[PDB]
Amino acid sequence: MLEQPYLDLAKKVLDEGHFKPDRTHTGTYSIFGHQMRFDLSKGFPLLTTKKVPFGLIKSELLWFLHGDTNIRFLLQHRNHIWDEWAFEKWVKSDEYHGPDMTDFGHRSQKDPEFAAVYHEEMAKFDDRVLHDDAFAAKYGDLGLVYGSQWRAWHTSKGDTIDQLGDVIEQIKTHPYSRRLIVSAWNPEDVPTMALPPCHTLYQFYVNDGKLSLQLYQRSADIFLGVPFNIASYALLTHLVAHECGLEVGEFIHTFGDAHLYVNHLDQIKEQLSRTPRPAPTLQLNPDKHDIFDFDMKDIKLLNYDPYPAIKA
Amino acid sequence: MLEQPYLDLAKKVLDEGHFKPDRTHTGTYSIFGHQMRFDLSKGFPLLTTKKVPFGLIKSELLWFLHGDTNIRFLLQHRNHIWDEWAFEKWVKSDEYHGPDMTDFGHRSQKDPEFAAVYHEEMAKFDDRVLHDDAFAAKYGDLGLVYGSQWRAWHTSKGDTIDQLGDVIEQIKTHPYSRRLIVSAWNPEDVPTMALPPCHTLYQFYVNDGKLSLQLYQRSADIFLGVPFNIASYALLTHLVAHECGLEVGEFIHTFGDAHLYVNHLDQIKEQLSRTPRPAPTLQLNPDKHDIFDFDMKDIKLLNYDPYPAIKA
Ligand SMILES: CC(=O)c1ccc(N2C(=O)c3cccc(C)c3C2=O)cc1
Ligand SMILES: CC(=O)c1ccc(N2C(=O)c3cccc(C)c3C2=O)cc1
Ligand SMILES: O=c1ccn([C@H]2C[C@H](O)[C@@H](COP(=O)(O)O)O2)c(=O)[nH]1
Ligand SMILES: O=c1ccn([C@H]2C[C@H](O)[C@@H](COP(=O)(O)O)O2)c(=O)[nH]1
């Protein structure tokens, strides 16, 4: 079944993973160099063994695809997955006057009443970002995240390049190019930036009218992140194929360090109990073609029948 | 045996490769997403099934490692593998006054007497680069090749960064970092530069005192280039491990497009006849540690017992 490589990766880290220390709990179990392949003609690789929220994946991807780095767009779609890094820039600031949190998130799991103050402050931040243009410009903007690296890469001349747009024009004109690459890794930013990109780079490839995509991901939370990551890049591959008038080929997912956190171990073990179901199918607006102006409604997922989410 | 993944890749492209057109003969047979793993504790993965010239690999790597882009250093080691791209910038120039070649190399294989004129002009160029400081500065310098991307990456402030040096300091201080990445792909240069890098990016990883390295290579000539490529990055991995006082782990070689040229087919087929021999062993200067000042003599290869070279 389509999603088995994901479950093999989880199991392989369980059986053959190497322990290492770090932060956010005791440490990790990891392997280096693993690869997962998904034949996108067999269905869409959204995990059936655990519910993965496709609406949050769709809206995050469309956000990148607009070259947008402001969480306001994501808030307008009820998508809060980028909030904390924005919240963090505001909390750590001089403009902020509420109950202090030197390290929320860590402390948010401990207290059942600091989690009360935090979730209110965060709710307030979310609202000011939604309705106050200047506050949003200042704190809603994450700066160097995927929308900018993909579509507005900052040059030495103080100019800006649309890598993804240029690659898509090349797919249409030079489909057999071996240079169809988008990188998110900028040696100039990477040593000071808040979040050096995990989704380091990707490459397209065309054969027999089918579009494939390989992602090199330097670092991967196998439990929390990888199931979202697989669905974002599979969707990316479908959308680019649609624009270019091609079929879909393979999505190949290649890792540097893929890891399980030492406290996510029983969660992934229970998921290994479950038996994949047949895969959903994706439907794209058949009469719209520029994916940089696609909206939520232009993307549909059919027949998705997941096991429950594992709140971990 | 250590080199079997190389031979499996060759065979897989023979059996399951997809034809595509291009240039420099009729076209290619290719696959996308293949991976090769080499356990460097089992020996050094220089191919035994075809002689690969380790001196040219050593000197090219030391050249990158000095951050040098001038072919003069390579000429001083009798290494001509970068010559033609330098020669090309001089031939295409206004300063040049000899018998013209709008497209040598292509025409060099045809004629058995234009190949005579070319090899003389090239011999002259080589000599002027060796002995004329100003000519060398102007034409010996390839500009944006690996030595500059690895060790002198050009920033927006008109400054320069030593990616590889900084990564090596991080391996020593933060060995479990998942950010040990060197990239050679610069979205600003890549659309005009002469040679967008094939060796797109690489990443280190440490576990149990062993250093591994994964290379993402966007495009690969399986017959001509890959056997040199495997030995450069394996050697790179050994040298970095030596500096840092670690053992060697795995070298993982990951491809975008790996291809066979439609006219190299019988050459690779004959190589598939041959039976790997036990692998050579590498010896490094046991009392020297900064690899950025290693020289030819500090690296030794023991017990290398190859089948003959296949002049193709
Ligand atoms: C600093 C760090 O380790 C870290 C960096 C990025 C994320 N991170 C996101 O921003 C993000 C957005 C949307 C989905 C997912 C699954 C993630 C995610 O995992 C999470 C942790
Ligand atoms: C333009 C192109 O296709 C092309 C780009 C780079 C190389 N190329 C080199 O510069 C080079 C230097 C040293 C060894 C090898 C095996 C290679 C190589 O294959 C060869 C061809
Ligand atoms: O899109 C993402 C972003 C992050 N991660 C996880 C993997 C790592 O646990 C962590 C990255 O932290 P560093 O490796 O950068 O230290 O986030 C993902 O799976 N997908
Ligand atoms: O270090 C190198 C450099 C090049 N190649 C081969 C692979 C491709 O045939 C060609 C690159 O041409 P493009 O893919 O950039 O068009 O060079 C290698 O194997 N190793």
Which ligand is nearest to the Cα of residue B223, counting in written order?
4
B156 touches chain A (CB under 8 A): yes
Rg (chain B; Cα; Å): 20
Bridging pattern class, strands B210-221 and B247-261 = parallel
Q: Residue B263: CB partners within 8 Å, gap ≥ 6?
A: B25, B26
Bridging pattern class, strands B181-183 and B199-207 = antiparallel
Concatenate the DSSP letters of all residues of B105-126 into one string.
THHHHH-SSHHHHHHHHHHHHH
Asked if B90 and B71 count as a contact pair (C-beta separation under 8 A), the reply is: no
> Is the sign of the CA dihedral A194, A198, A200, A204 positive or negative?
negative
Residue of A nearest to B208 (CA): A18
Which amino acid does the sequence have at A285? Answer: N
| Angle (nearest 5°) at CA A45 between B33 and B11 | 25
Query: Rounded to whole angstroms, what are the CA distances from B268 to B10, B20, B52, B216, B279?
Result: 7, 18, 14, 23, 20
Beta bridge partners of B254: B35, B216
Asked if B171 and A167 count as a contact pair (C-beta separation under 8 A), the reply is: no
A220 lines ligand 3 (CB under 6 A): yes
If we measure between CA atoms, which residue out of B277, B299, B276 comes closest to residue B286?
B299
- For helices B226-243 and B54-65, what crossing angle results, to 10°? 50
Asked if A91 and A101 count as a contact pair (C-beta separation under 8 A), the reply is: yes
Query: Rounded to whole angstroms, what are the CA distances from A188 to A68, A155, A198, B186?
Result: 21, 11, 16, 10
Instruction: Please state, as a whole number, how many other Cβ atoms lie within 10 Å of the Cβ of residue B188.
Output: 18
Question: H-helix or E-strand containing A182?
Answer: strand A181-183
Task: Tell if the CB–CB gap between A33 and B183 is shorter than 8 Å.
Answer: no
Exposed/middle/buried for residue A36 (C-beta within 10 Å: 0-12, 13-18, 19+): buried
Q: How far apart are CA B153 and CA B147, in angstroms?
A: 9
Residue A282, both tokens: 């994706």
The response to whether B260 counts as a known ligand-binding position is yes
> Which residues of B belong to the active site?
198
B81 lines ligand 2 (CB under 6 A): yes
- 3-state percent breakdown (helix, strand, coil) of chain A, nearest 5: 40, 20, 40
Task: Tell if the CB–CB gap between A257 and B219 is shorter than 8 Å.
Answer: no
Q: Is A23 in a helix, a strand, or coil? A: coil
Question: H-helix or E-strand containing A163?
Answer: helix A163-173
A133-169 exposure pattern, b = at least 16 Cβ within 10 A, e = fewer: eebbeebbbbebbbbbbbbbbbeeeeeebbbbbbbbe
Which own/partner contact pairs does A157-165 have at CB distance under 8 Å and 24+ positions apart?
Answer: A158/B156, A161/B187, A161/B188, A162/A67, A163/B187, A164/A65, A165/A292
Q: Of ligand 2's atoms, which has the minimum distance to the CA of residue B219?
A: 3
Residue of B34, B146, B198, B268 to test ligand 4 pocket, by largest number of atoms within 8 Å of CB: B198
B27 lines ligand 4 (CB under 6 A): no
Q: Is A263 in a helix, a strand, or coil? A: coil
Q: What is the 3 state secondary structure string of B9-67?
A: HHHHHHHHCEEEECCCCCEEEEEECCEEEEEHHHCCCCCCCCCCCHHHHHHHHHHHHCC
Helix ranges (DSSP H) in A53-111:
54-65, 72-75, 83-91, 106-110
Q: How far apart are CA B122 and CA A262, in angstroms?
A: 61
Q: Residue A183: CB partners within 8 Å, gap ≥ 6?
A: A149, A163, A200, A201, B183, B185, B187, B200, B201
If we measure between CA atoms, which residue out of A236, A263, A279, A253 comes closest to residue A52?
A279
The response to whether A37 counts as a known ligand-binding position is no
Asked if A5 and A32 count as a contact pair (C-beta separation under 8 A), the reply is: no
Domains of chain A and CATH, by start:
1-312 (3.30.572.10)
The response to whether A72 counts as a known ligand-binding position is no
For ligand 2, the distance from its centroid to the CA atom of residue B196, given in whole angstroms, is: 11
Q: Is A97 in a helix, a strand, or coil? A: coil
A55-94 exposure pattern, b = at least 16 Cβ within 10 A, e = fewer: ebbbbbbbbbbebbbbbbbbbebebeebbeebbebbbeee
Instruction: Please state, as a whole number, how many other Cβ atoms lie within 10 Å of the Cβ of residue A277.
Output: 15
Q: How far apart are CA B171 and CA A252, in angstroms?
A: 28
If we measure between CA atoms, which residue out of B192, B184, B193 comes closest to residue B148?
B184
B53 lines ligand 2 (CB under 6 A): no
Task: Tell if the CB–CB gap between A37 and B37 is shorter than 8 Å.
Answer: no
Q: Of ligand 1's atoms, which has the minimum distance to the CA of residue A24?
A: 3
Beta bridge partners of A251: A38, A213
Q: Of ligand 1's atoms, which has the minimum distance to the CA of residue A228?
A: 16
Task: Tell if the CB–CB gap between A207 and B18 is shorter than 8 Å.
Answer: yes
Bridging pattern class, strands A281-284 and B35-39 = unpaired
Mutate to test the interface with B, among A32, A180, A210 (most CBs of B within 10 A): A32
B202 lines ligand 2 (CB under 6 A): no
Q: Is A27 in a helix, a strand, or coil? A: strand
Provide the shortest C-alpha distance from residue B297 to chain A (in Å).
32
Q: Is A287 in a helix, a strand, or coil? A: coil
For ligand 3, the distance from its centroid to the CA atom of residue A61, given in whole angstroms, is: 17
Residue A201, both tokens: 């780079």
Q: Tokens 């900064």 map to which residue? A: B290
Beta bridge partners of A161: A153
**Cα A258 from chain centroid?**
15
Exposed/middle/buried for residue A51 (C-beta within 10 Å: 0-12, 13-18, 19+): middle
Q: Residue B89: CB partners within 8 Å, gap ≥ 6?
A: B139
If we measure between CA atoms, which residue out of B97, B74, B73, B37 comes closest to residue B234?
B37
Asked if A197 and A149 count as a contact pair (C-beta separation under 8 A), the reply is: yes
Provide the shortest C-alpha distance from residue A121 to chain B (in Å).
32
Go through chain B and list every residue after which a break occurs, taking a C to next N gap over 2.5 angstroms, comma-separated.
none
Concatenate the DSSP letters of all residues of chain B into one string.
-TTHHHHHHHHHHHHHPEEEE-SSSSEEEEEES-EEEEEGGG-----SSS---HHHHHHHHHHHHTT--BHHHHHTTT--TTHHHHHHHHHTSSS--SS--TTTTHHHHH-SSHHHHHHHHHHHHHHHHHH-HHHHHHHTB--SSHHHHHH-EEPTTS-EE-HHHHHHHHHHH-TT-S--EEE---TTTTTTSS---SEEEEEEEEETTEEEEEEEEEEEETTTTHHHHHHHHHHHHHHHHHHTT-EEEEEEEEEEEEEEETTSHHHHHHHTTS---PPPEEEE-TT---GGG--GGGEEEES--PPPP---
Q: How far apart are CA A189 and CA A193, in angstroms?
A: 6
Provide the shortest C-alpha distance from residue B85 to chain A (in Å).
19
Q: Of ligand 2's atoms, which has the minimum distance to the CA of residue B145?
A: 10
Q: How far apart are CA A21 and CA A10, in angstroms?
A: 19
Task: Tell if the CB–CB gap between A214 and B32 is shorter than 8 Å.
Answer: yes
**B161 vs A156, A188, A212: nearest CB:** A188
B3-38 exposure pattern, b = at least 16 Cβ within 10 A, e = fewer: bebbbebbeebeeebbebeeeeeebbbbbbbbbbeb
A177 touches chain B (CB under 8 A): no
Query: Rounded to whole angstroms, what are the CA distances from A114 to A80, A86, A111, A186?
Result: 19, 19, 5, 37
Asked if A184 and A201 count as a contact pair (C-beta separation under 8 A), the reply is: yes
Asked if B167 and B181 count as a contact pair (C-beta separation under 8 A), the reply is: yes
Q: How far apart are CA A187 and CA B292, in angstroms?
A: 20
Instruction: Kindly list the residues from chain A whose CB atom is less than 8 angstroms away from the CB atom of residue B22.
Output: 176
DSSP code at position A67:
T
> Is the sign of the CA dihedral B37, B43, B46, B47 positive or negative?
negative
What are the backbone angles phi and psi of residue A194, rounded to the nearest 5°? -65, -40
Exposed/middle/buried for residue B282 (C-beta within 10 Å: 0-12, 13-18, 19+): buried
Q: Tokens 């900018």 map to which residue? A: A148
**B18 vs A179, A208, A257: nearest CB:** A208
B26 touches chain A (CB under 8 A): no
Four-CA torsion B223, B226, B231, B236, nearest 10 degrees: 160
Task: Tell if the CB–CB gap between A156 and B188 is shorter than 8 Å.
Answer: yes
Question: H-helix or E-strand containing A122?
Answer: helix A114-131
Which own/partner contact pairs does A105-112 have at CB distance under 8 Å and 24+ positions apart?
Answer: A106/A24
B254 touches chain A (CB under 8 A): yes
Asked if B255 and B247 count as a contact pair (C-beta separation under 8 A), the reply is: no
Asked if B33 and A212 count as a contact pair (C-beta separation under 8 A), the reply is: yes
Beta bridge partners of A29: A19, A260
Task: Tell if the CB–CB gap between A181 and B200 is shorter than 8 Å.
Answer: yes
Exposed/middle/buried for residue B85 (C-beta within 10 Å: 0-12, 13-18, 19+): middle
Nearest CA to ligand 4 atom 3: B198
Q: How was this structure obtained?
A: X-ray
The response to whether A236 counts as a known ligand-binding position is no
Which amino acid does the sequence have at B37? Answer: R
Q: Tokens 């990316």 map to which residue? A: A236
Q: How far apart are CA A161 and CA A123, in angstroms?
A: 35
If we measure between CA atoms, which residue out of A187, A132, A182 comes closest to residue A161?
A182
Q: Tokens 């100019």 map to which residue? A: A159
